[PDB]
Amino acid sequence: LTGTGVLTESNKKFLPFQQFGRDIADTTDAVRDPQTLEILDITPCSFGGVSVITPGTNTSNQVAVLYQDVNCTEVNVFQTRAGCLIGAEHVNNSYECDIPIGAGICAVASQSIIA
Amino acid sequence: GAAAYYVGYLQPRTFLLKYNENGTITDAVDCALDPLSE
Amino acid sequence: AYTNSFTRGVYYPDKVFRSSVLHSTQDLFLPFFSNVTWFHFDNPVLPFNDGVYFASTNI
Amino acid sequence: TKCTLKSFTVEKGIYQTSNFRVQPTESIVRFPNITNLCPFGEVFNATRFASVYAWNRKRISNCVADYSVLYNSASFSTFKCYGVSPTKLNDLCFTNVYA
Amino acid sequence: YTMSLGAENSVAYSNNSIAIPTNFTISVTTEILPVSMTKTSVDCTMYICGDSTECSNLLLQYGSFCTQLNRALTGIAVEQDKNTQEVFAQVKQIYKTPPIKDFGGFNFSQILPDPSKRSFIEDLLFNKVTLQKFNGLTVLPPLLTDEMIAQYTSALLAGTITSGWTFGAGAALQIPFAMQMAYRFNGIGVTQNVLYENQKLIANQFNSAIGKIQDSLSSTASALGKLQDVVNQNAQALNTLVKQLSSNFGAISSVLNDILSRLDPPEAEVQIDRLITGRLQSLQTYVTQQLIRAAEIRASANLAATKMSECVLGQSKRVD
Amino acid sequence: DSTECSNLLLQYGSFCTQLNRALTGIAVEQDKNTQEVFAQVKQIYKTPPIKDFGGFNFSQILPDPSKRSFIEDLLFNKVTLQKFNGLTVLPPLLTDEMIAQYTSALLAGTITSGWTFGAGA
Amino acid sequence: QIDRLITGRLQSLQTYVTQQLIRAAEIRASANLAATKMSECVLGQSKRVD
Ligand SMILES: *[C@@H]1O[C@H](CO)[C@@H](O[C@@H]2O[C@H](CO)[C@@H](O)[C@H](O)[C@H]2NC(C)=O)[C@H](O)[C@H]1NC(C)=O
Ligand SMILES: *[C@@H]1O[C@H](CO)[C@@H](O[C@@H]2O[C@H](CO)[C@@H](O)[C@H](O)[C@H]2NC(C)=O)[C@H](O)[C@H]1NC(C)=O
Ligand SMILES: *[C@@H]1O[C@H](CO)[C@@H](O[C@@H]2O[C@H](CO)[C@@H](O)[C@H](O)[C@H]2NC(C)=O)[C@H](O)[C@H]1NC(C)=O
Ligand SMILES: *[C@@H]1O[C@H](CO)[C@@H](O)[C@H](O)[C@H]1NC(C)=O
Ligand SMILES: *[C@@H]1O[C@H](CO)[C@@H](O)[C@H](O)[C@H]1NC(C)=O
Ligand SMILES: *[C@@H]1O[C@H](CO)[C@@H](O)[C@H](O)[C@H]1NC(C)=O
Numbered sequence: 001l002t003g004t005g006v007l008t009e010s011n012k013k014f015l016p017f018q019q020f021g022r023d024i025a026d027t028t029d030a031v032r033d034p035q036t037l038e039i040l041d042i043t044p045c046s047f048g049g050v051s052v053i054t055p056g057t058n059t060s061n062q063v064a065v066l067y068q069d070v071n072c073t074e075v076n077v078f079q080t081r082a083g084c085l086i087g088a089e090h091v092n093n094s095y096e097c098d099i100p101i102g103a104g105i106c107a108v109a110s111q112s113i114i115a
Numbered sequence: 116g117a118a119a120y121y122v123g124y125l126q127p128r129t130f131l132l133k134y135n136e137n138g139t140i141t142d143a144v145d146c147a148l149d150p151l152s153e
Numbered sequence: 154a155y156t157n158s159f160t161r162g163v164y165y166p167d168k169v170f171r172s173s174v175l176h177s178t179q180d181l182f183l184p185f186f187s188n189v190t191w192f193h194f195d196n197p198v199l200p201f202n203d204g205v206y207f208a209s210t211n212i
Numbered sequence: 213t214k215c216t217l218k219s220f221t222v223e224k225g226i227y228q229t230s231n232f233r234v235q236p237t238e239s240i241v242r243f244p245n246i247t248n249l250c251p252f253g254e255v256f257n258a259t260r261f262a263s264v265y266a267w268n269r270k271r272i273s274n275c276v277a278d279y280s281v282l283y284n285s286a287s288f289s290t291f292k293c294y295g296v297s298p299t300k301l302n303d304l305c306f307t308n309v310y311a
Numbered sequence: 312y313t314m315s316l317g318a319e320n321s322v323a324y325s326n327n328s329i330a331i332p333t334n335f336t337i338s339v340t341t342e343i344l345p346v347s348m349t350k351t352s353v354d355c356t357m358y359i360c361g362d363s364t365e366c367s368n369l370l371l372q373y374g375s376f377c378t379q380l381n382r383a384l385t386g387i388a389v390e391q392d393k394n395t396q397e398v399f400a401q402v403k404q405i406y407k408t409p410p411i412k413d414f415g416g417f418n419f420s421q422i423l424p425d426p427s428k429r430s431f432i433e434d435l436l437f438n439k440v441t442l443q444k445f446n447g448l449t450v451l452p453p454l455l456t457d458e459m460i461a462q463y464t465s466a467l468l469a470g471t472i473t474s475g476w477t478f479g480a481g482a483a484l485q486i487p488f489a490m491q492m493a494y495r496f497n498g499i500g501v502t503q504n505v506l507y508e509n510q511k512l513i514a515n516q517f518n519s520a521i522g523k524i525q526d527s528l529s530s531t532a533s534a535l536g537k538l539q540d541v542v543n544q545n546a547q548a549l550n551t552l553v554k555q556l557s558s559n560f561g562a563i564s565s566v567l568n569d570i571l572s573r574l575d576p577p578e579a580e581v582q583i584d585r586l587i588t589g590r591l592q593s594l595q596t597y598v599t600q601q602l603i604r605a606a607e608i609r610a611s612a613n614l615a616a617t618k619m620s621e622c623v624l625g626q627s628k629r630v631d
Numbered sequence: 632d633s634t635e636c637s638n639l640l641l642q643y644g645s646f647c648t649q650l651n652r653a654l655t656g657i658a659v660e661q662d663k664n665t666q667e668v669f670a671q672v673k674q675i676y677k678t679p680p681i682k683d684f685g686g687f688n689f690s691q692i693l694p695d696p697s698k699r700s701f702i703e704d705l706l707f708n709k710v711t712l713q714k715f716n717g718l719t720v721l722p723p724l725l726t727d728e729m730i731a732q733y734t735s736a737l738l739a740g741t742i743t744s745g746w747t748f749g750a751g752a
Numbered sequence: 753q754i755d756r757l758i759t760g761r762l763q764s765l766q767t768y769v770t771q772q773l774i775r776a777a778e779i780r781a782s783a784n785l786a787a788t789k790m791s792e793c794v795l796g797q798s799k800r801v802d
């Protein structure tokens with residue numbers, strides 16, 4: 001079996017005559033090591049979409065980057081429910097939504113990006 | 116003291132098996148028995 | 154001496170692990186509520202008929 | 213963004229430009245602990261071959277494979293596989309083999 | 312049996328006589344309308360090949376197929392937020408409900424929000440219904456969160472109590488509630504005095520009707536089948552799409568990793584090309600059906616917005 | 632009725648189930664459009680036996696118990712309406728002599744009662 | 753050869769179904785308008801012009 005992912009100890013109780021399992025639709029969840037007979041789950045490493053926030057082309061060449069639904073623990077830094085947004089400056093006061101992001105947060109003012 | 120023993124035969128009949136939280140088969144429906152199971 | 158094979162005869166079709174999920178597969182099984190043969194003596198030889206369900210309770 | 217939108221000017225707003233993922237590291241391999249080879253010579257180095265109408269057949273199991281000796285050497289006059297690349301034969305684990 | 316169409320009555324029609332009402336029942340009615348779907352988004356290049364350079368190498372021979380599909384899905388997820396903005400966000404600003412509540416005896420406490428949490432009914436509604444994603448599929452969040460929508464609806468029905476159709480033209484004008492209802496009666500064709508003389512009975516019927524709705528919803532299942540349907544359809548489309556990955560499509564194997572792991576590039580590319588053709592056709596089918604459903608929802612949202620404009624911010628004259 | 636073709640069809644997965652479901656959804660919608668258009672009245676009102684509607688001649692609009700109304704028969708004489716394999720057609724839920732009874736109820740209501748018939752009693 | 757015939761016929765059928773779905777959606781729109789006209793013009797007296 002040749003694939004990629006993260007191997008973790010499996011609490012999912014196998015039976016003496018099971019080598020690996022699938023939770024749904026051919027998605028193999030675990031496997032028993034052919035040496036130590038231990039069952040480890042394969043949870044694929046995080047991935048997803050990346051989007052760019054810009055004020056345009058003439059207004060500025062600066063840009064903020066949003067990593068959709070990713071906890072910023074992998075590669076300023078501010079976390080939302082849309083995902084982790086890096087490059088924008090967070091502010092407290094509220095305004096009219098200019099550039100929509102998601103989950104009620106929108107984004108340029110005073111020569112920089114604001115969230 | 117003759118004891119009893121039952122004997123049946125198998126057939127290729129599609130079954131739908133119900134798995135529990137323990138990964139154990141606890142029920143099943145025979146998909147060609149009657150109109151309801153069908 | 155016939156009998157009612159109520160629901161017995163289900164088995165694990167493969168060595169793969171599933172849980173908390175319904176799965177439908179096609180294989181050789183024992184049709185539900187079919188009749189079964191009952192023996193108690195006379196032990197004849199028996200056709201194997203592409204698989205055999207056997208059950209009993211120590212002769 | 214300019215690259216995806218096919219323009220040297222990109223107006224205001226939000227644009228999705230690509231996906232991302234974290235690349236795998238430190239390759240691992242777990243084969244079974246069994247360590248012993250099969251009598252491959254016994255398959256090729258023998259004169260007791262069966263007649264076609266009475267073709268013989270044996271089984272090969274519970275051993276270490278490695279057929280590069282048979283694959284590359286001129287020992288065989290014909291070497292053709294059906295659905296399997298011979299150059300990967302050593303890296304393919306099987307349940308049994310029938311000869 | 313052969314179905315009956317209805318009760319057979321025959322109005323006694325002559326030419327010298329008329330029937331006229333001598334009483335009235337005010338009542339309430341619930342009307343349910345969907346206005347959105349889950350903002351589905353799928354990465355085509357990962358869906359078809361995923362973590363395989365050679366596969367995408369062959370995919371490049373089909374040009375922009377992924378680009379067109381991705382773009383179409385973006386255009387629908389965008390108009391779902393447009394639909395929600397168009398139906399709810401029709402109020403210039405956020406009105407507030409005055410703290411002292413003496414609306415002529417009319418008990419509106421089960422419609423207005425309670426700062427403890429949404430209104431009682433809204434909470435019952437949310438708890439009435441029962442709202443996967445593992446390989447290149449995701450769902451984007453909505454722009455307007457639940458608390459933000461419940462803030463629009465609180466501003467809306469906190470306006471129409473205090474100002475009526477007025478607040479939907481210009482500045483709000485405070486008018487005592489009972490006077491407003493009396494006017495609306497004049498608006499139908501019943502002399503204003505009828506409301507004042509019978510104010511107590513009217514308030515009682517209104518309240519006992521709100522309580523009847525509260526209990527109809529609190530007990531009758533399948534109240535929101537129309538709303539549940541959209542969720543079921545979205546879930547079904549996603550589950551079928553995911554399931555299709557196990558289909559062989561005439562290949563030697565349904566898994567790309569094994570074919571690739573054991574076949575020389577010639578035969579391997581052939582089997583890959585077969586798999587790709589199959590998976591691509593499945594994706595095209597999915598996106599087409601999703602677009603049709605989106606168009607139907609767009610029409611539904613437009614109807615809902617129209618109904619809100621004429622029935623909430625004013626008083627409809629058109630019948631039924 | 633080709634076993635080999637069937638075998639060569641399973642390799643393509645749930646295509647047929649999906650197509651069948653689509654045609655079922657539309658057929659249900661077709662039965663709903665008629666339930667939603669004609670079935671607007673809860674009772675079946677009937678035209679009074681004596682007809683003295685202030686001089687307005689209705690005899691060509693109302694049903695004629697000889698058979699539908701005259702105009703409807705004319706309409707059914709102006710249109711130009713099988714299955715062989717794998718293809719079929721389902722009958723509608725509401726038959727012709729049922730729809731014509733919804734029309735002959737809404738029309739026997741609007742006459743006697745004005746618009747109140749569909750507002751309340 | 754069978755695979756070739758199957759792919760072809762399957763595609764022709766999927767095309768048919770797609771066209772039926774679009775046509776059905778347009779008919780639905782028409783039926784909705786008809787329902788509105790029956791509700792507003794027959795069961796009462798519409799005032800909107802034309
Ligand atoms: C107005 O008067 C008519 C004439 O009787 C009433 O019509 C009938 O009611 C009686 C029972 O009271 C029935 O037996 C008749 O079959 C009805 N139809 C006729 C006579 O054509 C009518 O009900 C009266 N209006 C009200 C509101 O009661
Ligand atoms: C119009 O109908 C209402 C329906 O409630 C009548 O109200 C009832 O009147 C009776 C007789 O006084 C009381 O016993 C009930 O308690 C009233 N019901 C409610 C809910 O308060 C009303 O009387 C009717 N109009 C006339 C003129 O009789
Ligand atoms: C409006 O009606 C609500 C009923 O929902 C009233 O609330 C209740 O008052 C009773 C009387 O003591 C309490 O037992 C209930 O617990 C209260 N809450 C509910 C949810 O029933 C409310 O007081 C009424 N207000 C006015 C002004 O009529
Ligand atoms: C594997 O086998 C070797 C000897 O054959 C032994 O030393 C080692 O402990 C074994 N490991 C396991 C996990 O069985
Ligand atoms: C961009 O900004 C400049 C000045 O800020 C303005 O002149 C121009 O019209 C804007 N739009 C463009 C370059 O498309
Ligand atoms: C993200 O990671 C932090 C720390 O690793 C953790 O506390 C948090 O629960 C995670 N999830 C979110 C949504 O922040």
Ligand SMILES: *[C@@H]1O[C@H](CO)[C@@H](O)[C@H](O)[C@H]1NC(C)=O
Pocket residue numbers: 090091092093
């Ligand atoms: C925002 O509010 C929090 C909570 O009072 C405070 O700690 C923080 O300094 C504020 N930041 C700004 C930029 O106002």
Ligand SMILES: *[C@@H]1O[C@H](CO)[C@@H](O)[C@H](O)[C@H]1NC(C)=O
Pocket residue numbers: 136137
């Ligand atoms: C099976 O799972 C249940 C929870 O669903 C648990 O209570 C039980 O201990 C598990 N093991 C069994 C039943 O052997």
Ligand SMILES: *[C@@H]1O[C@H](CO)[C@@H](O)[C@H](O)[C@H]1NC(C)=O
Pocket residue numbers: 252253254256257
């Ligand atoms: C046959 O015997 C010769 C002589 O030892 C040896 O070189 C050769 O490898 C043998 N053949 C096989 C298939 O092992």
